[PDB]
Design a protein around this ligand. Structure first.
Ligand code: SF4
Lengths: 571, 162, 191
C-alpha cells in the first residue's frame, strides 16, 4: 500500500477508545491523506474529549496545532458535517508516536468555541490567531484580541470573502498610526494586553525585530506579552491565491535561513495530494540540500550566540547552493516532480571540498565552546524547564530533545528516504538549558555533516523527476521535443496542476524545530486551505512561562538562545 | 603619577625631564607605568573601557542623541585626550625629548607615535572585559599596588639619600 | 544636464536648469561640499526580515545620514519606517534593497505596503530577491555620483533654499550596449 493512500484510520486504537468512551456516534471519522486519524467532534463534547485524550495511559500531551478554516466555499464535502467554518486541533502523542486531529464544525450565526487554554496553555496564541484571521470567537479566553493585525483592523483576513489584495495606500491612515505610536506610552492601558495593574513600570522593548512589552519590579521582570505580527506577510492567504506550483517561493520565504528545508514540506504534501512517489535520487538530493541549509542555519545560530559573549563557512555553503540551484538564499528549486534541474557536472568536487575542511572547523568550534567559562557561566541555569513547560508550550526544537524527550521527525516519522541514512540524533539530559541547546545543535551539525558525507558516497543515478503525469513541471527536454509533455507543461504552467479534492499533511524536522504543512484541496488548481505550523510561534509563546522571575539581560540572553525568526513566527 | 613626582621631587615637567637625564623612569617604576597607562586609557574612555552599557539593556551610550559637530567634537576630544596621555606617558616615564643623534622634537614625536601604535596594538589584542572585573581590578588590584609602589619608591629614594 | 527643484510624496517638482550657470568661488565650494558628502557616507541599515541579514555579510540614527530599507513594507512597521525617516537630518538619502522595498515585491497582499515609495522619497533602488552585497556596493557608487552632482543650499540664511536633484541617465539606457551585445552564455549543465 502506498503511503499517500486515502486512509480512514479506524484501526487506530485511539478511535476505539473514543468509541468506548463517547459511544459509536457523536463523532465522525474522516478519511484523508493526512496520515493521521481525523475525527469531527461536536462543540459541546470538545472539552471532555480533550480531557479524555489528556488522561490516556499514553496521553496526547502536546497541542501541535490549532487553527480555523472557512468551509463556506468548499464544494467537495462528502462524509463531513454541515459546517460554515471549522476549527481543527492537531494533537501529538510521543509515547504512542502518533497524532490525531479534532475538527469542530461551526455555523455563521454562532462562531463560538469553548477555549482550550485550560487544557493546553499554548492554545492562547493559536486562539488569538484564529480570532484575528477568522471570525471565530473563543469563550472564556483572557485578552482575546488580534495578534497578527493591529487592533484597528475591520475585517478578518483568512475569511474567503476578504480580498487578498493590497488596497490603496492612504497617508491619512499612516498618520493616524504614527500619532498612535507617538502616544502609545502615554495612553497605555494595561488591561487590553492582559496585565496586572508602585514598582511596576510598563515599557515597550523594541532574528527579526519585534516589540515585547515588559512589566518591571525595578529591574526584575514580572510580566511580558511579546507583541508579534510585525512581520506578517500573509503566506496562507496567498496560498489560497497562488497555484500549487507558484507557491514554492512563498514557502521559501517564510523561514529564510531554512529555505529549501521550508519548501520541503509543501512539496511533500503536494505529492501526497497528487499521489506521487518520487524516486530515490530525488530523495537523496532533498536530504542533501535540507542538511546543507540546516548546517547554514545552525552555523549562523552558533555564531550569533557566541558573538556577543563564521563568514567563510556560510559563503562556501552558499557557493555550493548557487552551483546546485539558482541564487544562494531562496533556491525555489524543489518542484512537484521533485527538483527543477538535475545536479551539475561538478557537485562531487564542491561537496568533497566542503566535507574535507569542515571537521577541523567543528573541532575549533567545540574547543571554543568548551573553554569559554564566561559564556558557560552566563548560559548555565537560565530559563530552566524540564519536559513539562516544553511538553505543553509546543517547543519542538532543540529544547524538546534537551529535556530528554526522544522525538525527532526524521526518526519517528521518516520522510524522503531518511531511513536509508545512518545518523544518531542527540538528546539532552533533564534541564533544557541554553548551553545544552547550543551543544545539541552542535551535535546536530556534526550529524548533518555525517548525513552529507553519506549523500556524497552513495548517490543513485536515476531520474530527477517522477514518471507521474502530475509532476509540475514535466522534464524540459521532453517538453521541447514531445507534444504530450508540451500539453502537460502548458496546462501545469498556465492554469496549474489539477489535483483531486483531498486533505494532506506533512510534518518535517526543520532547521529550528518541527515545521508542518496542512493542505486542503477543493479539486481546483489553487489551494483551498494552506496551514503552516511553525516552531518559532510556540517558541515565542513560552517566554512568559520561563522568564517570570528573571532580569532583562537574562530575557535577551534567552531570546538569543532561542533560534526563532520573526518572519517564521508571523508567516 | 606621584610615583614619578616622588622620584623626581617636583611637579614641573622640565624637572621631570632633567631628573630623567641618566635613567628613564619606566625601568624603576614599571608598576607606576602600567597603572598610569590603564588609568589614562580608562579616563579617555578608550576601547577596553568603552560602552559600559553593553552589559545591560536598560542603559544606552551617552554618545547618542548627539548629531553632527557635537558628536564629532566628542570623537576628536577623545583622540586629543589619548594623544596627550601618550605625550604625558613618554615625558613622565620615557626620556622627554632625550636622544643620541636625532633632534629632541623629532625624538619626542617618534616616541609619541610609538605609544600611539602601541595603543593601536593593545586595542587590536585585548578583548573587552565586562563591568564587574573592571571595577574589581580598578579598585582592588590598582589602588593598593600604586600605594605600595609609592611606599617602595619612598624607601629606595630615602635609602640612597646623600 | 537638467535638474528637479524641491522647495518649500504629495509635493510638486519642476524640471529646471542648475543655478550654477547663471560666481566662481561658489562653484568650487559647492563641489567640495558635494565631494565631502559623497566620500564619507554613513548608513543606517534598518533591521527587517530577509534583506537585512543579506547585507550583514557586506550605527545609531541621526548621525547616519542615510537609510537602507531592506525588507518587506508591513503596515504595522510602515509608521516605524516613516518615524525613523523623520528622525534623520537633512541631507538624507534612501537606498531600497530587494523587490519588497521598491514595490510590493511578490507580496501584493493586504498586510504589505507596496514599497516605501508610497510614503518616503527614495534616491536609489536595487531590484530583486536578496541582492548581492556587490549590488549594494554598486548602488553606493551610483548614489555617490548622484550626490556629487547636486545643488543643495550651503546655508539656511544666505542663498537659494532649494534642493536640486540631478536627472541621471537611467542605467538600462547607459548599459544598453553591453547588455544587448551578449552573444553566448555558459550552459547550465555544469559549474
Ligand atoms: S526581496 Fe526577497 S530577501 Fe529581500 S525582503 Fe523581499 S522576500 Fe526577503
Amino acid at each position: 500500500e502506498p503511503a499517500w493512500q486515502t486512509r480512514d484510520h479506524l484501526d487506530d486504537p485511539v478511535i476505539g477508545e473514543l468509541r468506548n468512551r463517547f459511544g459509536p456516534d457523536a463523532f465522525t471519522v474522516q478519511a484523508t491523506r493526512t496520515g493521521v486519524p481525523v475525527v469531527w467532534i461536536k462543540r459541546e463534547q470538545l472539552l471532555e474529549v480533550g480531557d479524555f485524550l489528556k488522561k490516556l495511559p499514553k496521553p496526547y500531551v502536546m497541542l501541535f496545532d490549532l487553527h480555523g478554516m472557512d468551509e463556506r466555499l468548499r464544494t467537495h464535502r462528502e462524509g463531513l458535517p454541515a459546517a460554515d467554518f471549522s476549527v481543527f486541533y492537531h494533537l501529538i502523542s510521543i509515547d504512542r508516536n502518533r497524532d490525531i486531529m479534532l475538527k469542530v464544525a461551526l455555523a455563521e450565526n454562532d462562531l463560538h468555541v469553548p477555549t482550550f487554554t485550560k487544557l493546553f496553555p499554548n492554545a492562547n496564541w493559536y486562539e488569538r490567531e484564529t480570532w484575528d484571521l477568522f471570525g471565530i470567537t473563543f469563550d472564556g479566553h483572557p485578552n482575546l484580541r488580534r495578534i497578527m493585525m493591529p487592533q484597528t483592523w475591520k475585517g478578518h483576513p483568512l475569511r474567503k470573502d476578504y480580498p487578498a489584495r493590497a488596497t490603496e495606500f492612504s497617508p491619512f491612515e499612516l498618520t493616524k498610526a504614527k500619532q498612535d505610536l507617538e502616544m502609545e506610552a502615554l495612553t497605555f492601558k494595561p488591561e487590553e494586553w492582559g496585565m496586572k495593574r508602585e514598582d511596576f513600570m510598563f515599557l515597550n522593548l523594541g532574528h527579526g525585530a519585534f516589540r515585547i512589552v515588559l512589566q518591571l519590579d525595578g529591574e526584575e521582570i514580572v510580566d511580558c506579552v511579546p507583541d508579534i505580527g510585525y512581520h506578517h506577510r500573509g503566506a496562507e492567504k496567498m496560498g489560497e491565491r497562488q497555484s500549487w506550483h507558484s507557491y514554492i517561493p512563498y514557502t521559501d520565504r517564510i523561514e529564510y535561513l531554512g529555505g529549501c528545508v521550508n519548501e520541503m514540506p509543501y512539496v511533500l504534501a503536494v505529492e501526497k495530494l497528487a499521489g506521487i512517489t518520487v524516486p530515490d535520487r530525488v530523495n537523496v538530493i532533498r536530504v542533501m540540500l535540507s542538511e546543507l541549509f540546516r548546517i547554514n542555519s545552525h552555523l549562523l545560530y552558533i555564531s550569533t550566540f557566541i558573538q556577543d559573549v563564521a563568514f567563510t563557512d556560510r559563503q562556501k555553503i552558499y557557493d555550493l547552493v548557487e552551483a546546485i540551484t539558482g541564487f544562494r538564499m531562496h533556491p525555489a528549486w524543489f518542484r512537484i516532480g521533485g527538483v527543477a534541474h538535475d545536479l551539475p557536472r561538478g557537485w562531487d568536487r564542491l561537496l568533497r571540498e566542503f566535507l574535507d575542511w569542515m571537521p577541523k572547523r567543528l573541532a575549533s568550534y567545540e574547543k571554543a565552546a568548551l573553554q569559554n567559562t564566561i559564556l558557560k557561566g552566563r548560559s548555565q541555569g537560565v530559563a530552566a524547564y524540564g519536559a513539562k513547560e516544553a511538553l505543553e508550550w509546543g517547543t519542538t526544537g532543540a529544547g524538546l530533545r534537551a529535556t530528554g524527550i526522544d522525538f525527532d521527525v526524521r526518526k519517528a516519522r521518516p520522510y524522503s528516504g531518511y531511513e536509508n541514512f545512518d545518523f544518531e540524533i542527540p538528546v539532552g539530559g533533564g534541564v533544557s538549558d541554553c548551553y545544552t541547546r547550543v551543544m545539541l545543535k552542535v551535535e546536530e551539525l556534526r550529524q548533518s555533516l555525517r548525513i552529507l558525507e553519506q549523500c556524497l558516497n552513495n548517490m543513485p543515478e536515476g531520474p530527477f523527476k517522477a514518471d507521474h503525469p502530475l509532476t509540475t513541471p514535466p522534464p524540459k527536454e521532453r517538453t521541447l521535443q514531445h507534444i504530450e509533455t508540451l500539453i502537460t507543461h502548458f496546462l501545469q504552467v498556465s492554469w496549474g496542476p489539477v489535483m483531486p479534492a483531498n486533505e494532506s499533511f506533512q510534518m518535517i524536522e526543520a532547521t529550528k524545530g518541527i515545521n508542518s504543512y496542512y493542505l486542503t484541496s477543493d479539486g481546483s488548481t489553487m489551494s483551498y486551505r494552506t496551514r503552516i505550523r511553525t516552531p518559532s510561534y510556540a517558541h515565542l509563546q513560552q517566554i512568559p512561562a520561563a522568564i517570570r522571575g528573571s532580569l532583562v539581560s537574562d530575557l535577551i540572553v534567552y531570546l538569543g538562545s532561542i533560534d526563532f525568526v520573526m518572519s517564521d513566527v508571523d508567516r | 603619577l606621584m610615583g614619578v613626582v616622588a622620584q623626581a621631587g617636583s611637579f614641573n615637567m622640565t624637572d621631570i625631564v632633567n631628573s630623567q637625564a641618566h635613567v628613564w623612569n619606566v625601568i624603576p617604576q614599571f608598576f607606576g607605568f602600567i597603572t598610569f597607562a590603564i588609568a589614562g586609557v580608562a579616563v579617555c574612555h578608550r576601547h577596553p573601557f568603552d560602552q559600559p552599557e553593553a552589559e545591560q539593556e536598560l542603559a544606552d551610550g551617552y554618545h547618542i542623541e548627539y548629531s553632527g559637530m557635537k558628536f564629532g567634537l566628542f570623537f576628536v576630544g577623545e583622540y586629543i585626550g589619548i594623544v596627550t596621555i601618550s605625550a604625558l606617558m613618554v615625558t613622565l616615564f620615557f626620556g622627554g625629548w632625550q636622544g643620541p643623534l636625532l633632534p629632541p622634537f623629532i625624538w619626542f614625536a617618534l616616541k609619541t607615535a610609538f605609544f600611539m601604535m602601541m595603543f593601536i596594538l593593545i586595542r587590536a589584542s585585548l578583548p573587552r572585559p565586562r563591568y564587574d572585573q573592571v571595577m574589581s581590578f580598578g579598585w582592588k588590584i590598582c589602588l593598593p599596588l600604586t600605594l605600595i609602589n609609592l611606599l617602595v619608591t619612598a624607601a629606595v629614594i630615602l635609602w640612597q639619600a646623600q | 544636464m537638467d535638474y528637479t527643484l524641491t522647495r518649500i510624496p504629495l509635493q510638486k517638482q519642476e524640471i529646471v536648469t542648475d543655478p550654477l550657470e547663471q560666481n566662481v568661488f561658489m562653484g568650487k565650494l559647492n563641489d567640495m561640499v558635494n565631494w565631502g558628502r559623497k566620500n564619507s557616507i554613513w548608513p543606517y541599515n534598518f533591521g527587517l526580515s530577509c534583506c537585512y541579514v543579506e547585507m550583514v555579510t557586506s550605527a545609531s540614527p541621526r548621525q547616519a545620514d542615510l537609510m537602507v530599507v531592506a525588507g518587506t513594507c508591513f503596515t504595522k512597521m510602515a509608521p516605524v519606517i516613516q518615524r525613523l525617516y523623520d528622525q534623520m537630518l537633512e541631507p538624507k538619502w534612501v537606498i531600497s534593497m530587494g523587490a519588497c522595498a521598491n514595490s510590493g515585491g511578490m507580496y501584493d497582499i493586504y498586510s504589505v505596503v507596496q514599497g516605501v515609495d508610497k510614503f518616503i522619497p527614495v534616491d536609489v533602488y536595487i531590484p530583486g530577491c536578496p541582492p548581492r552585497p556587490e549590488a549594494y556596493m554598486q548602488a553606493l557608487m551610483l548614489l555617490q555620483e548622484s550626490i556629487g552632482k547636486e545643488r543643495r543650499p550651503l546655508s539656511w540664511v544666505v542663498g537659494d533654499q532649494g534642493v536640486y536633484r540631478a536627472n541621471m541617465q537611467s542605467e538600462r539606457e547607459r548599459k544598453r550596449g553591453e547588455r544587448i551585445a551578449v552573444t553566448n552564455l555558459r550552459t547550465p549543465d555544469e559549474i
